[PDB]
Design an enzyme around this catalytic site. Structure first.
Site, mmCIF file in Angstrom:
data_model
loop_
_atom_site.group_PDB
_atom_site.id
_atom_site.type_symbol
_atom_site.label_atom_id
_atom_site.label_comp_id
_atom_site.label_asym_id
_atom_site.label_seq_id
_atom_site.Cartn_x
_atom_site.Cartn_y
_atom_site.Cartn_z
ATOM 1 N N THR A 1 0.728 -1.010 0.173
ATOM 2 C CA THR A 1 0.069 -0.109 -0.093
ATOM 3 C C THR A 1 0.780 1.229 -0.006
ATOM 4 O O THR A 1 1.894 1.536 0.467
ATOM 5 C CB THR A 1 -0.710 -0.003 1.241
ATOM 6 O OG1 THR A 1 -1.667 -0.977 1.321
ATOM 7 C CG2 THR A 1 -1.695 1.162 1.426
HETATM 8 C C1 LIG Z 1 -0.061 -2.534 0.215
HETATM 9 C C2 LIG Z 1 -0.953 -2.439 -1.177
HETATM 10 C C3 LIG Z 1 0.408 -3.826 0.056
HETATM 11 O O1 LIG Z 1 1.681 -3.541 0.433
HETATM 12 C C4 LIG Z 1 -0.984 -2.230 1.333
HETATM 13 O O2 LIG Z 1 -0.245 -2.579 2.592
HETATM 14 C C5 LIG Z 1 -2.147 -3.403 1.290
HETATM 15 C C6 LIG Z 1 -3.317 -2.940 2.400
HETATM 16 C C7 LIG Z 1 -4.570 -3.402 1.978
HETATM 17 C C8 LIG Z 1 -5.594 -3.012 3.060
HETATM 18 C C9 LIG Z 1 -6.797 -3.646 2.826
HETATM 19 C C10 LIG Z 1 -7.100 -4.424 1.804
HETATM 20 C C11 LIG Z 1 -6.241 -5.014 0.752
HETATM 21 C C12 LIG Z 1 -4.773 -4.410 1.107
HETATM 22 N N1 LIG Z 1 -1.692 -4.446 1.932
HETATM 23 C C13 LIG Z 1 -1.753 -5.773 1.606
HETATM 24 O O3 LIG Z 1 -1.912 -5.835 0.229
HETATM 25 C C14 LIG Z 1 -1.181 -6.825 2.304
HETATM 26 C C15 LIG Z 1 0.096 -6.896 2.355
HETATM 27 C C16 LIG Z 1 0.852 -8.272 2.966
HETATM 28 C C17 LIG Z 1 1.156 -9.260 2.587
HETATM 29 N N2 LIG Z 1 1.466 -9.892 3.637
HETATM 30 C C18 LIG Z 1 1.660 -9.117 4.453
HETATM 31 C C19 LIG Z 1 1.089 -8.001 4.439
HETATM 32 C C20 LIG Z 1 1.175 -7.060 5.179
HETATM 33 C C21 LIG Z 1 1.574 -7.212 6.396
HETATM 34 C C22 LIG Z 1 1.856 -8.645 6.788
HETATM 35 C C23 LIG Z 1 2.048 -9.453 5.874
HETATM 36 N N3 LIG Z 1 -1.550 -8.128 1.623
HETATM 37 C C24 LIG Z 1 -2.363 -9.050 2.480
HETATM 38 O O4 LIG Z 1 -2.424 -9.082 3.462
HETATM 39 C C25 LIG Z 1 -2.614 -10.297 1.579
HETATM 40 C C26 LIG Z 1 -2.630 -11.306 2.676
HETATM 41 N N4 LIG Z 1 -3.966 -10.135 1.131
HETATM 42 C C27 LIG Z 1 -4.619 -10.670 0.365
HETATM 43 O O5 LIG Z 1 -4.052 -11.849 -0.404
HETATM 44 C C28 LIG Z 1 -5.718 -10.375 -0.109
HETATM 45 C C29 LIG Z 1 -6.393 -11.176 -1.033
HETATM 46 C C30 LIG Z 1 -6.002 -12.412 -1.997
HETATM 47 C C31 LIG Z 1 -7.578 -10.672 -1.154
HETATM 48 C C32 LIG Z 1 -7.718 -9.274 -0.498
HETATM 49 C C33 LIG Z 1 -6.477 -9.397 0.385
HETATM 50 C C34 LIG Z 1 -8.796 -8.887 -0.091
HETATM 51 C C35 LIG Z 1 -9.952 -8.948 -1.240
HETATM 52 C C36 LIG Z 1 -9.886 -10.245 -1.998
HETATM 53 C C37 LIG Z 1 -8.631 -10.914 -2.011
#
Ligand SMILES: *[C@@]([C])([C][O])[C@](*)(=O)[C]([C]C1=[C][C]=[C][C]=[C]1)[N]C(=O)[C]([C]C1=[C][N]C2=C1[C]=[C][C]=[C]2)[N]C(=O)[C]([C])[N]C(=O)C1=C([C])C2=C([C]1)[C]=[C][C]=[C]2
Ligand SMILES: [Mg+2]
Lengths: 231, 235, 195, 244, 222, 233, 240, 211
Positions: H1
């Protein structure tokens, strides 16, 4: 008299008055009839209203796709006991992939009610239940009393003026048991049975409540214009 | 002495029956359900003229689509309201939707019989729960300390209840408008109240699908009182 | 957080605390006030792990404010410092300790004396004429050892404090974004808005 | 069940009184009189032991006057065993405060704590209240010399001079008559003993039927000393004041 | 040391149409380099016109589906046989997943159905409960193989109209159920070729106002 | 969390036209030591179900007792305990599957792999797998441990898909199982020659065969094999 | 634990324990609350049966809950301390979790909730205490005065009295207090509060306590001489 | 993000990106990183998606109950503190949540930064996420209190664009919000692919990139 202050006290003749007083609450309740054939089982319940502006208190509760009951007495106690049945029917399905036997459902209700009749502080349940169901050994009808006594029957009735319907079923025994593969005729016999307990009032569209379960019939409740067919 | 959860020889719980007597001593509350909305009205009944009447809160919001009026030991209602509000908002958290009026009422009524020797006694207050949902439309429920709840087209609770209920028996029909219901609550309240009805000692409220639950201003109610007086003098 | 300094002069206690707050590689704020008023004549500055510092400070503040209302009386700086120490000593053997170091600057209205107490996260209390936490003392204590007198005025205390901050700004690798300075004396607590 | 045998110790009467508290006060009215008198330069605590024997070991005996800490003491009227339960709790509270704030506990704070414990027994728990009334004599640097009393209800009040136990009505009248604000410890000692000598149910007031204590700033320079009088010292002060 | 988690492979695919939705998944179940079953259903009809699949560690997936099916049953009991909407189911599933935030259900979950306006709906979850409504989503082992294809062939990404040269995009015309099923079958055939954990069989569940229908297609067994 | 101590190796099974077959050897290994030679790892439940268990034997004996207790409990207040309300294979499996997944969720697993083979009330074949992780699956052929790698390929040549089940007789199915057990004896270092075999048929019921041996083994060709490359003598 | 249901309904629909708690309030010394245009005054009776009292250290009848809210009471003294403590703890708890001091209405609602809880909890008896809670909301110049009672009901009052002979002083307030024009100044507000107590008190010496609360945490307690001047002026006008 | 938020003369601007990652894999092209707590309260999201969604959705439950009990909307200061208190309960348990609570209350416009450590900071400008450094560069050199609603919205939009370009874990689209005393106003979803080329031409920026 001196021995009716709590459930933990026998009278000199070996009676439990609090349990008997709980039994009295059922007699004050509205009439409900239960009867079965070899293929189907039917509940018929006369619902009661507070006045003309009020709704008619619901009497029948679904416990599973294959099991449910009708109540007479304290409605909140029926909600507790039916909730317990819902959980037990559900425990059997989730753990053993097994539909709960109606006979075993009765045993569980008996044991739950009993604990309230032997301990200090609590009270007996103030409601009677008629459980119907279809399991691996066919159609079933149970009568539950809050003393703990559960009885498997061909047909029965509980509530106010229930003796009239019970006599009718005792005459009709040989007829309605043979009504196999005909849900409408079995309901007709139940509606005709509950009619023997009516005085002054008659069966109207928002007064009557019917439920049925059978071989290829999930437990379904009929209210409103769905029972106008049987009036 | 004797158990709190004791049955009488007639098959009634003593304490529940005694709490019903406390509710009879309470100030009058009336509810009328129509196809345009549900109206809730109460008698405030201030014990003294120095008591600021607007602080008397006997009509209460549970959610945007559910309102509630009370009668009896009104202090007992606070924990019930808190539970109702929590249940309503918690269901919105779990299911992303409004909660059904019946389900909300059932949640409140589950508290009722949780007493013994849990709380030490039943609640000494009755509630009129009015609201709207998409499945069953406009609804009015009467929640008692027995754990029982009846749906009503119209209902009165409190000290002038049986007199008001007889009046609601004749007046209610299925084609009532919201305005007609408002005047009808005011009319019956004025009939059973000890003191003369005005905007300071009586309060109105309603629940509509569009605007949700609203307590009426004293200025708005005052006009409806004046409108009532004129239409009664008209014949 | 980073740097907190304290000095007790003739008639007051002066606390200086950095303004920076850093998350990751970014400085989120350069005007943060790392202090809470515990009572009208008692000020506590703090530094340690993120989050724990403010939570601990506010928790102490609430407890002292509760004491003040209950007894209609202000606790002595010594009493407050002892209360705080016990809470930290209690905390160090907890499941998750509060990683917070504090300076407590107070003016005792009974004795008519300023008092400075230094307490670290273990519950190690010492009354001092001047104090610091972390690496701050490594740079500043040589200056304070040299220039400090007990009969110093508030204005002389501020000048010696400016020299300490200048030395920090010269020899520390981290940019702590200057300091907010507050003075605790008989009249209460006030902030020096130009430093 | 068990309900049958419950006396219900924590209920109101129709008049709005607490039965057990009122009956506990009735018990206390039969206890040996205790008197406290506050002066400008100290506090006096005087108390009467109940019908003693010649074979009672007096010099090692303690039924009336107890030390809570170096600055605070109490006089007891009622059940001694009940009082010792409360005394040991108060001793702990004073030490808890000293450990926490590194300062001796203010008198009122200690008194409020003990009175709150008594209160609890009248509102919840279904237990009988403590049949004890205390006179607290203490000093701190906020209010100086202080006298308080607490009773089974858990209500406490401050006093210049006060009595608890037997004949408090008579004793309070005598104190109210002769007490003055500019009074000193030596005068207060005399007033306390004279009051007991007139109110006592015994034939004559002697050293073996008394417990006596003073809290004086009559300690070398700005500090406070507690003096629990010995049997011989009570005998001397009885002669000095002209009672025996 | 005991490892409470495992990987049963598989891949799932949800696509939302204008007035329908599909949820597909292969029927192969595996551990390491072995095949447990060539036909082990992975997508389920949960009632109220909702279909669900939790793909990853099968034990956790079966537990979740079992629990959600149970949530639907109790929703009916508690709320007068009211129909559980797809948005309400999604929020309910979030709480099921986050309830085990510190010992997660190791699955990627997808549900499909119709919203309250009758339009097709797909919702996608992560293992700890984060969710959102989506038009298109592939989950599981070959999710990274399939999703770009769907960005291209469902949402017409990087596709422009000839002659304009990058000035005008391809318009987002809706897809029929017959067209979607083609993209589903081609997606799985392609995934079966290049992913060792994908194969054996394909089962598709189609959701319309008329109900839930099933279609089965064979896949390569190597 | 533990480690398995005394262990049983492969359990193998398959469906055929009128029922199911299951087999497992009689060995209880203690690491590389072939400690116990008289261990029964197929455990019948009633006359319609056989549970085959591999993995930790102490946990197997625990499961054996749970099943024994399950039969006792089912009979309580049950006039139809030997008829309509008798224990089904599906009931027994789901119970075990519930237990296995609960235990893994408490980080204290029953260190086993289990195959429940049986015939239902309506005559349908039942064959399903569950293990220490609570993972469950069903297939025309099922096998645990080494059996998964070596038995399944052979058994799948007989019943490759669902439609091959009605075409497979009990003689052909038993033959395939017995050959599979021989192959496992050739190639599994924690296997024994002695094994047990159970057949659950919808017509002939439960046939439980004990003290079976691997026979018709090929070893003669070993005499010709000399050295590891260049050696002739 | 002791779970006995002490507060229970009687056949006529009364909870006697709650009603007997009101009798304990009737016994308590008189307390009065009057709100002016820009202030609230809390008056309290001190029974003169207790002389030789140390007025420096004796618990005062009016208690600060926070810097902007005060609480006076009538009934059991020991019971009142428990409510006051709980109220003070909740006041700091609110500042800590919401970053605003409590409103007077909120604090009242909490104290009233505590009293209510003790009417339907096992093993406990109701508080034999009624309270007057007064003050000014943060950044608000409108006066606030609330009353609570053992049952747990609460309400806002222009002017109110509780305790022994409260019937008499309420009678006085009902005819003397005008809503359209309340006591415009502090003097008028205090004068009316002293006048009301002089209907009941006996002697106007050390028997009357007055506490004036003004906006923005401005709370002060009047001394004996200051009150004595009001007592003097009232009776001199009365001699006519 | 990447997320940002800043106070100005006409309220507060909130701008977020829309990407979601699972390692190098872009798991979502269009996720909503702003929550509409109430008509006058917004919450941005950065960190673990699940944590962000669960706890800010729960914050909305708790802010709604505040309105029902008090008959008044909750302040931004109190709302931020409730959230920071939720973080302190799961202190050290491994949550990952960075958020800005934006809104308008009786003190005017409000903005608080809250993270999983229980940190709660008041300020005029904040930016969270993997690409916050890029956003801060543009914000710091162009921010004024005297910005017009039109120029402010563009700054937030352009700042996210800067981050989306350079930060590999930021992109997809830009979601804009503008908070006034009559409530928040959504100002649309803006694809970064299209926005980049548009901004390049109109502004003359990104000269090094070829288009
Ligand atoms: C940046 C885009 C990523 O760096 C931002 O920080 C986002 C915030 C965000 C907030 C709300 C919804 C989605 C994103 N963060 C992520 O994308 C996080 C980054 C992350 C991965 N591992 C991790 C992270 C952060 C902290 C500790 C560990 N990504 C996730 O949380 C992953 C797990 N999310 C998914 O895979 C999702 C899927 C698939 C999915 C989501 C989230 C939402 C809706 C449909 C599918
Ligand atoms: Mg493949």
């Amino acid at each position: 008299n001196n021995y009716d202050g709590d459930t933990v006290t026998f009278s000199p003749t070996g009676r439990l008055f609090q349990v008997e007083y709980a039994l009295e609450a059922i007699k004050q309740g509205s009439v409900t009839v239960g009867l079965r054939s070899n293929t189907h089982a039917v509940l018929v319940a006369l619902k009661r209203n507070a006045d003309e502006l009020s709704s008619y208190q619901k009497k029948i509760i679904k416990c599973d796709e294959h099991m449910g009951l009708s109540l007479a007495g304290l409605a909140p106690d029926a909600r507790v006991l039916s909730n317990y049945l819902r959980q037990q029917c559900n425990y059997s399905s989730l753990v053993f992939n097994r539909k709960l036997a109606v006979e075993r459902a009765g045993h569980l209700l008996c044991d739950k009610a009993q604990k309230n009749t032997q301990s200090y502080g609590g009270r007996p349940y103030g409601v009677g239940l008629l459980i119907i169901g279809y399991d691996k050994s066919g159609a079933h009808l149970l009568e539950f009393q809050p003393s703990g006594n559960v009885t498997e029957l061909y047909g029965t009735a509980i509530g106010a003026r229930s003796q009239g319907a019970k006599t009718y079923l005792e005459r009709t025994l040989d007829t309605f048991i043979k009504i196999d593969g005909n849900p409408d005729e079995l309901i007709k016999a139940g509606v005709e049975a509950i009619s023997q307990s009516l005085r002054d009032e008659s069966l109207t569209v928002d007064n009557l409540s019917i439920a049925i379960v059978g071989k290829d019939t999930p437990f379904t409740i009929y209210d409103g214009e769905a029972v106008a067919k049987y009036i | 002495d004797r158990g709190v959860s004791t049955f009488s020889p007639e098959g009634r719980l003593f304490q529940v029956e005694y709490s019903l007597e406390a509710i009879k001593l309470g100030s009058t509350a009336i509810g009328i359900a129509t196809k345009e909305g549900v109206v809730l009205g109460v008698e405030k009944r201030a014990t003294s003229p120095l008591l600021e009447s607007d602080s008397i809160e006997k009509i209460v919001e549970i959610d945007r689509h559910i309102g509630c009026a009370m009668s009896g030991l009104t202090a007992d209602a606070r924990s019930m309201i808190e539970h109702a509000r929590t249940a309503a908002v918690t269901h919105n958290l779990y299911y992303d939707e409004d909660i059904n009026v019946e389900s909300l009422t059932q949640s409140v009524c589950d508290l009722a019989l949780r007493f013994g020797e849990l709380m030490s006694r039943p609640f000494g207050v009755a509630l009129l729960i009015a609201g709207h949902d998409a499945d069953d439309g406009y609804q009015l429920f009467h929640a008692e300390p027995s754990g029982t709840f009846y749906r009503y087209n119209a209902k009165a609770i409190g000290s002038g209840s049986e007199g008001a209920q007889a009046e609601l028996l004749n007046e209610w029909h299925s084609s009532l408008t919201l305005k007609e219901a408002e005047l009808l609550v005011l009319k019956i309240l004025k009939q059973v109240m000890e003191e003369k009805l005005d905007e300071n000692n009586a309060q109105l409220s309603c629940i509509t699908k569009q605007d949700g639950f609203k307590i009426y201003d004293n200025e708005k109610t005052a006009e409806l009182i004046k409108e009532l007086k004129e239409k009664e003098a008209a014949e | 957080m980073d740097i907190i300094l304290g000095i007790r002069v003739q008639d007051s206690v002066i606390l200086a605390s950095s303004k920076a707050v850093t998350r990751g590689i970014s400085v989120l704020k350069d005007s943060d006030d790392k202090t809470r008023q515990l009572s009208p004549h008692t000020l506590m500055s703090f530094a340690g792990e993120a989050g724990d510092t403010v939570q601990f400070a506010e928790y102490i503040q609430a407890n002292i404010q509760l004491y003040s209302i209950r007894e209609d009386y202000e606790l002595s700086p010594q009493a407050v410092s002892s209360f705080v120490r016990q809470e930290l000593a209690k905390s160090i053997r907890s499941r998750r300790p509060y990683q917070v170091n504090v300076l407590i600057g107070g003016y005792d209205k009974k004795k008519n004396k300023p008092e400075l107490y230094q307490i670290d996260y273990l519950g190690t209390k010492v009354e001092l004429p001047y104090g610091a936490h972390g690496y701050s003392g490594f740079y500043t204590f040589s200056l304070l050892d040299h220039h400090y007198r007990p009969d110093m005025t508030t204005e002389e205390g501020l000048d010696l404090l400016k020299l300490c901050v200048q030395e920090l700004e010269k020899r520390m690798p981290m940019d702590f974004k200057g300091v907010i300075v507050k003075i605790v004396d008989k009249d209460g607590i006030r902030q020096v808005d130009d430093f | 069940g068990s309900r049958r045998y419950d006396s219900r110790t924590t209920i109101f009467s129709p008049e709005g009184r607490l039965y057990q508290v009122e009956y506990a006060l009735e018990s206390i009215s039969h206890a040996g009189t205790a008197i406290g008198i506050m002066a400008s330069d100290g506090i006096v605590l005087a108390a009467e032991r109940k019908v003693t024997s010649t074979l009672l070991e007096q010099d090692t005996s303690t039924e009336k006057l107890y030390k809570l800490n170096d600055k605070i003491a109490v006089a007891v009227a009622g059940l001694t065993a009940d009082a010792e339960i409360l005394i040991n709790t108060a001793r702990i509270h004073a030490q808890n405060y000293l450990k926490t704030y590194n300062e001796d506990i203010p008198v009122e704070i200690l008194v409020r704590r003990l009175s709150d414990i008594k209160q609890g027994y009248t509102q919840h728990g279904g237990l009988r209240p403590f049949g004890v009334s205390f006179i607290y004599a203490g000093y701190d640097d906020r209010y100086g010399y202080q006298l308080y009393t607490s009773n089974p209800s858990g209500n406490y009040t401050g006093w210049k001079a006060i009595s608890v136990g037997a004949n408090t009505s008579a004793a309070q009248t005598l104190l109210q008559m002769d007490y003055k604000d500019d009074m000193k410890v030596d005068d207060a000692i005399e007033l306390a003993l004279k009051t007991l000598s007139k109110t006592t149910d015994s034939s004559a007031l002697t050293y073996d039927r008394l417990e006596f204590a003073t809290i004086r700033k009559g300690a070398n320079d700005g500090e406070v000393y507690q003096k629990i009088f010995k049997p011989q010292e009570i005998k001397d002060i009885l002669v000095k004041t002209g009672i025996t | 040391q005991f490892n409470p988690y495992g990987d049963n492979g598989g891949t799932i695919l949800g696509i939302a149409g204008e007035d329908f939705a599909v949820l597909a998944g292969d029927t192969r179940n595996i551990t390491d380099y072995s095949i447990n079953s060539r036909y082990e259903p992975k997508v389920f009809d949960c009632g109220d016109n909702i279909v669900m699949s939790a793909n990853g560690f099968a034990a956790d997936g079966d537990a979740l589906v079992k629990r959600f099916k149970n949530s639907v049953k109790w929703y009916h009991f508690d709320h007068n046989d009211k129909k559980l909407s797809i948005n309400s189911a999604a929020r309910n599933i979030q709480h099921l997943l986050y309830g085990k935030r510190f010992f997660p259900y190791y699955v990627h979950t997808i549900i499909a159905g119709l919203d309250e306006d009758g339009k097709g709906a797909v919702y996608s979850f992560d293992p700890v409960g984060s969710y959102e409504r989506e038009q298109c989503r592939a989950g599981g082992a070959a999710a990274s193989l399939i999703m770009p294809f769907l960005d291209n062939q469902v949402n017409f990404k990087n596709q422009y109209e000839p002659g304009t040269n990058g000035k005008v995009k391809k318009p987002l015309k809706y897809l029929s159920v017959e067209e979607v099923i083609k993209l589903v079958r081609d997606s799985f055939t392609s995934a079966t070729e290049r992913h060792i954990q994908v194969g054996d069989g394909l089962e598709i569940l189609i959701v319309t106002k008329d109900g839930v229908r099933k279609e089965f297609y064979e896949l390569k067994r190597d | 969390t533990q480690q398995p101590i005394v262990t049983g190796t492969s359990v193998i099974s398959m469906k055929y036209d009128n029922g199911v077959i299951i087999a497992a050897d009689n060995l209880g290994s203690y690491g590389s030591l072939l400690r116990f030679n008289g261990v029964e790892r197929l455990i019948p439940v009633g006359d319609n179900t056989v549970v085959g268990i591999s993995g930790d034997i102490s946990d197997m004996q625990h499961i054996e007792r749970l099943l024994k207790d399950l039969v006792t409990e089912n009979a309580y207040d049950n006039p139809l305990a030997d008829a309509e309300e008798a224990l089904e294979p599906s009931y027994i499996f789901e119970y075990l599957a519930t237990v296995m997944y609960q235990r893994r969720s408490k980080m204290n697993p029953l260190w086993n792999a289990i195959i429940v083979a049986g015939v239902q009330s309506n005559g349908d074949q039942f064959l399903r797998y569950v293990n220490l992780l609570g993972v469950t699956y069903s297939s025309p052929t099922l096998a645990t441990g080494f059996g998964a790698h070596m038995a399944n390929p052979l058994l799948r040549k007989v019943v490759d898909r669902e439609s091959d089940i009605p075409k497979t007789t009990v003689q052909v199915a038993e033959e395939a199982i017995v050959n599979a057990m021989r192959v496992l004896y050739y190639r599994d270092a924690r296997s024994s020659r002695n094994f047990s075999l159970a057949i659950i048929d919808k017509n002939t019921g439960l046939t439980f065969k004990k003290n079976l041996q691997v026979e018709n083994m090929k070893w003669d060709f070993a005499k010709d094999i000399k050295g590891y490359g260049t050696q002739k003598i | 634990g002791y779970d006995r249901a002490l507060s229970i309904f009687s056949p006529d629909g009364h909870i006697f324990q709650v009603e007997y708690a009101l009798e304990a309030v009737k016994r308590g010394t008189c307390a009065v609350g009057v709100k002016g245009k820009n202030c609230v005054v809390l008056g309290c009776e001190r029974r003169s049966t207790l002389k030789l009292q140390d007025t420096r250290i004796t618990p005062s009848k009016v208690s600060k809950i926070d810097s902007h809210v005060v609480l006076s009471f009538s009934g059991l003294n020991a019971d009142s301390r428990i409510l006051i403590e709980k109220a003070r703890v909740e006041a700091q708890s609110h500042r800590l979790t919401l970053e605003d001091p409590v409103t007077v209405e909120y604090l009242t609602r909490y104290v009233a909730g505590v009293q209510q809880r003790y009417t339907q909890s096992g093993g406990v008896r109701p508080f034999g205490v009624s309270t007057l809670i007064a003050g000014f909301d943060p950044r608000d110049d409108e006066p606030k005065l609330y009353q609570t009672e053992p049952s747990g009901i609460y309400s806002s009052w222009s002017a109110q009295t509780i305790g022994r002979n409260s019937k008499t002083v309420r009678e006085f307030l009902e005819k003397n207090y005008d809503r359209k024009e309340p006591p415009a100044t502090v003097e008028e507000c205090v004068k009316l509060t002293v006048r009301s107590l002089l209907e009941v008190v006996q002697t106007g010496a050390k028997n009357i306590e007055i506490t004036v609360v003004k906006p923005d945490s401005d709370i002060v307690a009047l001394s004996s001489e200051e009150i004595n001047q009001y007592v003097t002026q009232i009776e001199q006008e009365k001699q006519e | 993000t990447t997320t940002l938020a800043f106070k100005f003369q006409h309220g507060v601007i909130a701008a977020v990106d829309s990407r979601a990652s699972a390692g190098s894999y872009i798991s979502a092209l269009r996720v909503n990183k702003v929550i509409e707590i109430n008509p006058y309260l917004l919450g941005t999201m950065s960190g673990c998606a699940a944590d962000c969604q669960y706890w800010e959705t729960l914050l909305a439950k708790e802010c709604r109950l505040y309105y029902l009990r008090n008959g008044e909307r909750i302040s931004v200061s109190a709302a931020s503190k409730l959230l920071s208190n939720m973080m302190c309960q799961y202190r050290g348990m491994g949550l990952s949540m960075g958020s800005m609570i934006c809104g308008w209350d009786k003190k005017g416009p409000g903005l608080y930064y809250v993270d999983e450590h229980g940190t709660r900071l008041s300020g005029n400008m904040f930016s969270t996420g993997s690409g916050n450094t890029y956003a801060y560069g543009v914000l710091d050199s162009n921010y004024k209190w005297d910005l017009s609603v039109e120029d402010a919205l563009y700054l937030g939009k352009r700042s996210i664009l800067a981050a989306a370009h350079r930060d590999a874990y930021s992109g997809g689209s830009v979601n804009l919000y503008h908070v006034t005393e009559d409530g928040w106003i959504y100002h649309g979803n803006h694809d970064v692919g299209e926005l980049f080329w548009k901004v390049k031409e109109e502004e003359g920026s990104f000269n090094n990139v070829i288009g």
